[PDB]
Amino acid sequence: EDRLQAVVLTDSYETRFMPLTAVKPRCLLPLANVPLIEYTLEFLAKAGVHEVFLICSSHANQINDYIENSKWNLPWSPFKITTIMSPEARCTGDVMRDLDNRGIITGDFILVSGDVLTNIDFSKMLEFHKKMHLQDKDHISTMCLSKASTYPKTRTIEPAAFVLDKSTSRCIYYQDLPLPSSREKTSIQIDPELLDNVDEFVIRNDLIDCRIDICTSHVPLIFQENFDYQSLRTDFVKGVISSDILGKHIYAYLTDEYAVRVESWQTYDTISQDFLGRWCYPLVLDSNIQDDQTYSYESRHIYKEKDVVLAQSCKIGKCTAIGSGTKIGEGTKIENSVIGRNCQIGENIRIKNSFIWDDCIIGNNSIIDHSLIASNATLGSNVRLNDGCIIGFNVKIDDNMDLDRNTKISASPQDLDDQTLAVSIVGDKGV
Template sequence: MQKMKAVIMAGGFGTRMQPLTHSTPKPMLPIFNRPMMEYVLKKIISLGINDVVVLLYFKPEVIRNYFKDGSDWNVNIHYVLPDGDYGTAGAVRQAKEFLNEPFIVLSGDVVTDFNLSNILSFHKKKSSKITIGLTSVENPLQFGVVITDESGKIEKFVEKPTWGEVISDTINTGIYVIEPEILDYIPPKGSFDFAKDLFPLLMREGIEIMGYNLDGYWRDVGNPDSYRNVHKDIFLNRLNFEIEGRGIEQAEGELYLDGDAFISENVRIVEKAMIGDGARIEKGCLLNNVVVGKNAYIGPDCVIRNSIIWGNVKIEKGVFLDNAVVCNDVVIGKNVVAKAGVILAEGVEVGQFSVFEQDVVVWPNKKIDAASIVNNNVIWGSRYKNTLFESGMIIGKSNVEISCDVACKIGEAFGSQLPVGSKVIVGRDYDRAPRMIKRAFVGGLLATGMQVIDLRAVPPTVLRYAIASDDSIMGGVYFKRDLSDPASMEILLFNEHGLKLESSSSKAVDKAFFKEEFRRVDHTHIGRITDNELVIEENYRNYFESIESLIDSKVINESRLKVAFDLMYGISKEIVPKVLSDLRIDNIILNAHFDEIKLSNLDYYEKKSKNDVSNIVKALGLDLGILIYPHGQRRTIIDDKGRVLDRMESINVMLELMDIEASAGGRKFNVLLPTWSPDLNDGYYKHLNIKRGKYTDFTINELKQFDLISKVDGNCAFPSFSLYRDALFASLKLMELLAKHNVKLSQLGNGINHFFYKEFAIQCPQLKKGRVMKKFLEIAKSKRYSTVDGIKMWEDSINWIFVMPNPYKEQLDVCIQANDEKTGMEMFKHYCGLIKECIKSNG
């Protein structure tokens, strides 16, 4: 075999593994009483490789002290400790002096039984410069999805996708075989990642990247749940894993002794148990699929199931644990019960008779008093989240998942990303929970030295405009009730442009939150709050003046246009009446007051509002009606005949009016629409340059070049005013264009093609989404297709289907465009059948 070297990536912080990684680097977490990285090293040794480079960063001395120079494993280990965070590829570049031969890169925090000799053979056979190990997983969210052609050449990467971007279940395992000349493409300094930077660069340079599908077990041990699950998989023989130690058959299972341990004669072993050197298990205990670490003590009559006990743990008599992780140096008193799982970080003391009601975490060196009842309110949420953020916001149960102490920490995490003295604007809606949480969050901002401008109860559109229009503002935060779940709330974090945080910024907040790495300033630099009426009024005034400068109210007034607004009990009541009054627009306003009870049943009142406004428009002969949803970004349009426009009609109205306006001005307008928006009428809009794509793929300056950015339902942004949706401004613009061109809403759309366009939802288990999308992509490759946002596949020049996994629900979102309903429904029936068949398949 060609001489090879190996690189083990062992520098990660283990943020998602907290508190297991409080003082232990993630690669050193014990799997069956051996550091996870030791199994990776043994995989390398099995390939005949004896030169290994270990890349360090977080707590490097722990790894060095264990593996030393590698002589205990008959290998030579070279340690490289970069002087900064250089990213994944940049870290490997720091080891260039050791890598003058082909080398394989592996992560130190992965458990696998892959036969790695296969990827080495493939790499050599293809004369590849770089080969990526691939595999299929049920949940690809935390990994890079990879698309290859038949020869193994990689066509596309989707790095750590959302469910909306999952187009396959084939992912990047982080196993790379690399020729040394590839290192020349990596800059010697600065952060540079394999997936984010190096792979796109190589593809632009015309260097083929190959992918090889590895068969077998692979698990990235990235959070406490996966740490538990890898042990479960070993217990259940789901992978080829050699358990160290001496095996002793038992009546109901097998016992593995890793050294000298004392086990009382009447201890009952069910299925498997691994007992570490120096451990002591007293009489009457039952151990069912349990690992017990070095020098641990388990007292009489304990029942421990499906659990991992680390070293130097002391468990007193009569304790019951199921699905527990107990870290080093923990003491558990008599008769403690944790039937639904618990994680006890190092140094925790649990008093006798305590009960853990649900799967909870106790952080390091905490003391639980005797007879305590511990519930999940002491942790962030009732489950482990890979991130605080969902679709750019933080969502959780008020006063449970998002409690005051959690909010304060999020405030500290956000504030720590900004320079000391930065100005941050905060605001909220009327609900009591957002008011409470905002105050706690502001405390966290002040602790990091932020200067806080509190706009109190304010529409989010006003707050975002205030951020974007003032160069001295570095960010903002808005707190609001979750309209779909009255018991929950949302926290929205904005950057200096008034847009939701991009991925890199949200990840930085995540990291600071989970590691509790907060900047706490000296008392002389603690921030101040500005919340006086003059400042609040100034921000409202700026918002109003901008609207008035961009809307031609004269043409609306001269047309005598009349409109009905339903504000749906939301915070838009703070702005809509004043703007309509200032512009002297003839109007009727409904439900311009806060009603907590009605907001709790918004689905019912939405239907009622549509019916009420429709009847008012018809009865009074108004020109249109508009529903503005409670937080002021969404709207529904009702035409002069009282007809509620559907989603496609709403977008067509805006496009046709913009086309008329562009034609009158003798120019073309630029429009950005979603990938899945209908396109059969594009040719009808002669004066629109329509581009489809993903909003986040454009820079701020690129977005500002568009005249209209719209969703499929016609809720839109006008970049001349804002880059985000503002229902009030969009409604005023709609009224201006109707008045200016003397046209009725009901007259629009008569010249456009009428065709079939419909959105569907197909139920799909979360863990089957990747498999289904991979199958759909295989079908698409024989036709014209696109993988922007999801998978869009054309049957011909007109008929197409778009499939995207829903980010929050166990379903696939499907859009179909067709010549007619019969064709569209036949397409849906056909592809729905294929999807359901794939879901049922075990392959």
């Protein structure tokens, strides 16, 4: 039951975040004024990890530096960090092959794709996995699933329709749809290979992706054997179902509580909002995980760190978090928005449902609505932004600018409009 190793699939979903991920690594970016890797690490610790393995390729030096700086580098940690360095750009099959070549895989190894933070206890899950394994010899891997918000409507990228059994908790079919976004395929598929064996058929769609996998020693060998499987969800699970190796079982764990992985931008925002509220049961910033953090709890879901300065007569709405070393002026209307560490806010600024990253200067008499500002990117005087406007690294938005709905701004100093240099594109300036 004890002694379990962890392999984390990092630097995999780059260019999916279309403006960012070009200069700095994907996972190093802060969720709520603190890096995304830390949460994942915490989760792993909670689960039960004895050795840490990270897959790095895109900007690996920075990752290494971070690791060196991190708390787990010191000898007090039960798990040590040793990174896998591989050639640039490869699929999860190739990575698996590489891992196999090296050879550290023992027993029930943990494989996590992307970064996930959830509240559910893992020991029970592990126990369940063990018991099910003890049933039959040819058991493969565990999948995590959670109940969705009644009806699906905000899910377009990965709205997977899971046909499931109640007695064994096993997947029957996996399919992706663009149905709510584009009315071309509003569609359902069922295969007849497992009809006269299961009987209890339950057709469901409202289940959210987690992508946390508890895997046996068979999986890397399987990957080595069948080199056609580049992905792990679309081709692999389906293959397993359609009897690639005959007489084999897979898991689909069902939980009533919240569990969602990071995937896009709106989804990320939603996750952040959830974190801000009391959705996750023990996951709160006021506990202080990074040790340098000095967060404290206040009334009406408001987070305040130490050395946070806010001026008199500023009406605040609901759910606000402020990072350390902030100076905010007078006459501000703040509603459902997070302000980063050491940010300098001017005077008379109306904010609604927005997001502000680490060290950003917001200019006087500006309106920000449902838009994101990345690290070290500054807003000037009189800037009016609409819903879902992503701003990249070090973008200097100077005096007087207006940007419409869903305008993406580049991060590296290419194809998308508005650049890192002085003034965003209303008058042509840049490289």
